[PDB]
Write a protein that binds this ligand. Structure first.
Ligand code: CA
Ligand code: CA
Ligand code: CA
Ligand code: CA
Ligand code: CA
Ligand code: CA
Ligand code: CA
Length: 479
């Protein structure tokens, strides 16, 4: 059978302290080897213990707590509590608790009637040490009015799944995954939180974020970040679907992360850029709908940039690398900058800036007047003796609108390809146009740019900026 807290003396009347009865039900379920602790409809008042790590209710291995539904079963911190409480429901610190979860209930932090930092649901083994909770589940759970963190799974947790859950009106973050491994957040809503809707931090890796919605938060709707500690970066973070809109900061912020992907999401109405990527080694930005961002100021809907933490906790400089930005609808300017490696960068209807950096890159501007910047002669070249092509190709250059920014390369204009000029040439097929420097460097490399189509007769000098003054007069972007 199931274990009913009201059979253990829980009143569920909104005043009596039901902590002991709920914990007795949990302990009885544990003694039998596992089970379900069921709470009928009602408001159950709970309190904490002697220490912060005691939380309020200590859930245990093989024990699931199952209420009557969000707003129907409410576990609410007692009025006047003035003690920091790390997890109204939590597992034990120093124990690798496993195969437990919470279903069909509301956790209420009673922040209006209590003092101190309170978190709703807390998991993990020990900060900074090895060992993990595993097989943790939260389904159809609402966490509200906690002072710091609504859902705060922590270090370490393996195979956590939070689904169909809501976190709202919490102090800092509705959902925060700290060192989650092989974990899934799906079909959740995080809104009206103090700082973040969703926060993936502290070396979390192999995380799926599917069809989540974040709005009304004081900062990012979703942030994937290393954190404030000198620790390993998160990696393998796959965001699919969902919406991140009307937040006080960027819709989606990804910084100091490896192999992150954001696909199929709707990102609009945010105060900062819709998508901001800072020092990410491996970033896929695919088939998103990004519009009407930067509502509190800013010039870009999408920002790709590095992160200089040389004066920070790590002392390192992190370059954004290995970017594939394709298929997005972006109703504004996109700053698509990358570095060494092959990058595929596609703009949208806005006035975009594209620079793939070193390596062989494929650039396309889409609609609007787009600037394609080439900042170094080593960033696009062909070696004829080796018959090796490392030539950036521009897919859809439009001479009447787009601009090639070569202002820092020391070329003076079009010509025969020697002595500071670039030769405008057509391939023998008529399908490709080339801007070629016919002078080889010491390594036998020729600086070249490939443009798909036949542009020998329409591409002119005013389409290329050869120095700083020409860039000043011809610039197509505010970036
Ligand atoms: Ca239920
Ligand atoms: Ca534990
Ligand atoms: Ca464009
Ligand atoms: Ca590149
Ligand atoms: Ca264009
Ligand atoms: Ca060279
Ligand atoms: Ca390049």
């Amino acid at each position: 059978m199931d274990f009913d807290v009201k059979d253990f003396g829980a009143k569920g009347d909104g005043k009596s302290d039901d902590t002991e009865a709920i914990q007795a039900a949990i302990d009885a379920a544990y003694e039998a080897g596992g089970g379900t602790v069921r709470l009928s409809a009602g408001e159950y008042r709970v309190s904490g213990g002697d220490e912060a790590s005691d939380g309020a209710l200590m859930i245990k291995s093989n024990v699931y707590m199952d209420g009557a539904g969000m707003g129907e079963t409410v576990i609410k911190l007692v009025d006047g509590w003035d003690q920091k409480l790390t997890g109204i429901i939590r597992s034990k610190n120093g124990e690798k608790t496993h195969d437990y979860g919470i279903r069909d209930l509301t956790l209420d932090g009673n922040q209006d009637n209590t003092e101190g930092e309170v978190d709703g649901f807390y998991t993990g083994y020990i900060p900074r040490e090895d060992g993990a909770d595993y097989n943790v589940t939260a389904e159809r759970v609402e966490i509200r009015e906690v002072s710091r963190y609504g859902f705060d799974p922590h270090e370490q947790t393996i195979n956590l799944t939070i689904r169909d859950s809501v976190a709202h009106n919490n102090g800092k973050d509705g959902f925060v995954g700290d060192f989650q491994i092989d974990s899934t957040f799906e079909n959740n809503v995080s809104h009206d939180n103090g700082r973040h809707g969703f926060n993936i931090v502290t070396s979390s890796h192999d995380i799926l974020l599917r069809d989540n919605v974040a709005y009304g938060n004081g900062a990012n709707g979703l942030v994937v970040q290393r954190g404030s500690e000198d620790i390993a970066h998160p990696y393998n973070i796959q965001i699919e679907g969902g919406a991140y809109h009307d937040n006080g900061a960027e819709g989606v912020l990804i910084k100091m992360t490896s192999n992150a992907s954001l696909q199929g999401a709707e990102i609009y109405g945010n105060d900062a850029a819709g998508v901001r990527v800072r020092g990410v080694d491996g970033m896929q930005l695919l088939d998103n709908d990004i519009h009407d961002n930067a509502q509190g100021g800013g010039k870009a809907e999408i920002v790709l940039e590095d992160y200089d933490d040389r004066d920070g906790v790590s002392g390192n400089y992190y370059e954004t690398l290995n970017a594939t930005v394709q298929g997005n609808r972006v109703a504004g300017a996109a700053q698509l900058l990358s570095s060494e490696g092959r990058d595929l960068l596609d703009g949208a209807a806005g006035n975009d800036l594209l620079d793939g950096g070193a390596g062989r890159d494929t650039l396309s501007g889409g609609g609007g007047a787009d600037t394609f910047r080439f900042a170094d002669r080593q960033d696009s070249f062909r070696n004829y003796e080796g018959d090796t092509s490392r030539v950036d190709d521009i897919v859809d250059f439009t001479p009447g609108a787009d601009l090639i920014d070569l202002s820092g390369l020391g070329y003076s204009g079009l010509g025969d390809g020697y002595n500071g000029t670039l030769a405008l040439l057509l391939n023998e097929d008529g399908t490709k146009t080339y801007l070629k420097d016919r002078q080889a460097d010491a390594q036998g490399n020729h600086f070249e740019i490939a443009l798909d189509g036949n542009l020998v007769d329409s591409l002119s000098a005013t389409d290329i900026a050869f120095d700083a003054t020409q860039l000043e007069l011809l610039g197509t972007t505010d970036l």
